[PDB]
C-alpha cells in the first residue's frame, strides 16, 4: 500500500530472513518514484544482495562440480544444465536491480553520497553479470561495470572524505573488480592500498556515527591487499 506499510513489512521480512518478501516490498517502494531515505536505500541493498548472493554461492558450487566431472558426460551435462538454470535466475535478479537503478535511483539522486552509492550498486550488479557472462556479452558487460565504478570513484574522490564508508566500500569493490574480472592484481592492490593510506592520512575526518564501519572496511582493504601481494 503506502511507503510506510511496505517499509515496515520489509523490516519485518528481514528479521524473518525472508528476503524475496523484503525485496518485493522495497521494489514497490522504489517504483513509487520518490527518492529513498538512507534507511530505505539500505533495506533495498540488503534485500537484493541476499537474493542474488544465494545464486552466486550456488553457481560457484555447481560450476566447481561441473569441472570435477570431466569425462563423466552425464553428470557434467546435469551440472551444466543446472548452472544454466541458476545463471538465468541470477541474470533476472541483476536486470531487475539494474533497471531500478537506471529508471529511479540514479536519476533522482540529488546528493553526491546517493550518486556514489547507486553508481557503486550498478558497478556491483554488472560485475555479478560479468561473473556468469561468456562470449561477446562479457566484454560489453565488463565495460559497463567499469564505467559505473569509475564515475562513482571520481565523484567520491571529489565530494567525500577518504574515511567515508561508501568511499572505502567503493574502493574495496572496484579493487575486487580489477582482481576478479580484469585479471589485474597490481591495479587492484594499488587501488586498495591508496584507499587505505588516504584513510590513515585523515582519521580525524571520521564521524562518531560511522567510525566502526570505516575501520572495518579499512581492515578489509588491507586484508585483500596482503593476500593478493604475498
Amino acid at each position: 500500500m503506502d511507503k510506510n506499510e511496505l517499509v515496515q513489512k520489509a523490516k519485518l521480512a528481514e528479521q524473518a530472513e525472508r528476503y524475496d518478501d523484503m525485496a518485493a516490498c522495497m521494489k514497490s517502494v522504489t517504483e513509487q518514484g520518490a527518492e529513498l531515505s538512507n534507511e530505505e536505500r539500505n533495506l533495498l541493498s540488503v534485500a537484493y544482495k541476499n537474493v542474488v548472493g544465494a545464486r552466486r554461492s550456488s553457481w560457484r558450487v555447481v560450476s566447481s562440480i561441473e569441472q570435477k566431472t570431466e569425462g563423466a558426460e552425464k553428470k557434467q551435462q546435469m551440472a551444466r544444465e543446472y548452472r544454466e538454470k541458476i545463471e538465468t535466475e541470477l541474470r533476472d535478479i541483476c536486470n531487475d536491480v539494474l533497471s531500478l537503478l537506471e529508471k529511479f535511483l540514479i536519476p533522482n539522486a540529488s546528493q553526491a553520497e546517493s550518486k556514489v552509492f547507486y553508481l557503486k550498486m550498478k558497478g556491483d550488479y554488472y560485475r555479478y553479470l560479468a561473473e556468469v557472462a561468456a562470449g561477446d556479452d562479457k566484454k560489453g558487460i565488463v565495460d559497463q561495470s567499469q564505467q559505473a565504478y569509475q564515475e562513482a570513484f571520481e565523484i567520491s574522490k571529489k565530494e567525500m572524505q577518504p574515511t567515508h564508508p561508501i568511499r572505502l566500500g567503493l574502493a574495496l569493490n572496484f579493487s575486487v573488480f580489477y582482481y576478479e574480472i580484469l585479471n589485474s592484481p597490481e591495479k587492484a592492490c594499488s587501488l586498495a592500498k591508496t584507499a587505505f593510506d588516504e584513510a590513515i592520512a585523515e582519521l580525524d575526518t571520521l564521524s562518531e556515527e560511522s567510525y566502526k564501519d570505516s575501520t572495518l572496511i579499512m581492515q578489509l582493504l588491507r586484508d585483500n591487499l596482503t593476500l593478493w601481494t604475498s
Partner: peptide, 17 residues
Amino acid sequence: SRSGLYRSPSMPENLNR
C-alpha cells in the same frame, strides 16, 4: 584460494544499527 566455496572479498551488508 579460488574454489566452489570461495567468497569474493567485497563489501558485506553488515553491522546493522
